[PDB]
Amino acid sequence: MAPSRANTKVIVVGGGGTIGSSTALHLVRSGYTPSNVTVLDAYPIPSCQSAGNDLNKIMGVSADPAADAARQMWNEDELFKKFFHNTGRLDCAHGEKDIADLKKLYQNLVDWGLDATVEWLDSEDEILKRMPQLTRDQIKGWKAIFSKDGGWLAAAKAIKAIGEYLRDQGVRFGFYGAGSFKQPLLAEGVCIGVETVDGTRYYADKVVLAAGAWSPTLVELQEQCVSKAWVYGHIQLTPEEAARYKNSPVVYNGDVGFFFEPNEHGIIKVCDEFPGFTRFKMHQPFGAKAPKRISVPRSHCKHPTDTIPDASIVRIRRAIATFMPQFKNKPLFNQAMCWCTDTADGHLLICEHPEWKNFYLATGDSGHSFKLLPIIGKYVVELLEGTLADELAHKWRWRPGSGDALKSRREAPAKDLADMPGWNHDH
Ligand SMILES: Cc1cc2nc3c(=O)[nH]c(=O)nc-3n(C[C@H](O)[C@H](O)[C@H](O)COP(=O)(O)OP(=O)(O)OC[C@H]3O[C@@H](n4cnc5c(N)ncnc54)[C@H](O)[C@@H]3O)c2cc1C
């Protein structure tokens, strides 16, 4: 500790988002001086364009130690526990293949120690016992895994609760032109701070880039991360319709989509499941020699007249017709795109930059990292301090050329928004 923890200054770029807010939290909890920690975001915490700024996210149960460590904190941490809604989760499958995959997943969870809280549902009867709001006609031939531990996360409220703690402790903040990263400040091969769009300079000993889907746009990542959009929309229930779904399990079918119990206002959110969309644009990230075609997020917060593609509407209507056939005439409203960045292998990118000393990447969220909100900052702090477990250091390493992130671990290469009509309502 060249400076000690107490004397180390750290800038967290994207500190209004999932990984960034977690990092700031763990710096303060670890004993960094709060006023030595600066959170920079394009938008105030919880950032309007953060993938974590939503009513709800699912808690994926999986045979993953990092996810397990996060799940413990969602159950027990004084800050996080109140934002976890343990309603259970139903993972459903149909066809003689998706069912084979689900059976292998089930066996994997049992092998890893989850036998007491995971159940195999081998028939329509068994599915309807766990989710009686479904309709037999729509689930013919389905099988499911029920995860008793499992549920949904009040995502924006969790990030806001972090923001309140950081403010109360004395963390420094910069937003808008004073928070929008433009470039690292480098000197003699070392990163010694950040410059924002408006020309404000911040000097620090270490800088973390936790800019989510914006990370490959801000600095040269050699296509390790490719940014893609997922879609959702909303339906409004009457008070009596809503009461039928109170504390109901999350339902997911990889072939269809997923949905959540209604919020306090009777609104259900419905998501597609698909390989995501790029939005290619010429852009020159810091460190690129010239402009290049990269997927650049089309931010709903900056372009609030945007919706989602016509093809996404078709798929979400199909999700509603399957899960919720009695609500098929309800309008789908507040349609929006949300952005994530995929790696080729779907693992995180948590590493020091190989040339810019003291600049650290904390991205590659790969569409499945909101569940890690409580724990991920601990790993980032351990990276800064040189104490991250070897296995995780290897898994999350700098790895350009390690495969094609446009397809990643998904079913197909993502299609581009330029080719998908229906979302753009600009002049
Ligand atoms: C539709 C949808 C459904 C999802 N469902 C789930 C789910 O059920 N379960 C799950 O675990 N995960 C889910 N996710 C994934 C999860 O939301 C993400 O993996 C995670 O939130 C990404 O965290 P992040 O910190 O990398 O990015 P973000 O939370 O998006 O944060 C990045 C931050 O960088 C900031 N930033 C951008 N540009 C700049 C700049 N120039 N300067 C400074 N700051 C900047 C942004 O404003 C933002 O606040 C879902 C995502 C989507 C899109």
Numbering used by the authors: 1 to 427
From the paper:
Fructosyl peptide oxidases (FPOX) are deglycating enzymes that find application as key enzymatic components in diabetes monitoring devices. The inability of wild type FPOXs to act on intact proteins is the most critical issue limiting both their diabetes detection efficiency and their protein deglycation potential. This is due to their buried active site and narrow access tunnel, as determined in multiple crystal structures. In that account, using a rational design approach involving a five-amino acid deletion at the entrance of the active site and a number of further mutations, we described a stable PnFPOX mutant (named L3-35A) that, relative to the wild type enzyme, features a significantly wider and shorter access tunnel.
Hence, we set out to design mutations to enhance the catalytic activity of X02A, the most thermally-stable mutant of our library. In the first design (X02B), four mutations were introduced in positions that are directly facing the tunnel in order to match the residues found in PnFPOX (D60G, A61V, D62S, D368H). In essence, by reintroducing conserved tunnel-lining residues in the X02A sequence, we generated the X02B and X02C mutants and we tested their activity toward the same panel of substrates that were tested with the parent enzyme. It is worth noting that the X02B and X02C enzymes present limited activity toward the dipeptide (≈ 0.87 and 1.62 U/mg, respectively) compared to the WT (32.60 U/mg). However, while the WT significantly shows little, if any, ability to catalyze the oxidative reaction on the F6P hexapeptide (0.78 U/mg, which is equivalent to 2.4% of the activity on fVH), the X02B and X02C mutants feature significant activity also on the hexapeptide (0.18 and 0.43 U/mg, which are equivalent to 20.7% and 26.5% of the activity observed on the fVH). The comparison shows that X02B and X02C have significantly higher activity than AnFPOX-47 toward F6P. Moreover, X02B and X02C feature a much higher Tm relative to all the other L3-35A mutants, i.e. 60.17 °C and 64.02 °C respectively. The X02B enzyme features a wide and short tunnel (bottleneck radius of 3.0 Å and length of 10.2 Å), in between the WT and its parent L3-35A, while at the same time showing a similar activity on both small and larger substrates. Hence, the wider tunnel of X02B, while reducing the stabilization of small substrates (and, as a consequence, the catalytic activity towards them) allows larger substrates to access the catalytic site more easily, leading to comparable enzymatic activity.
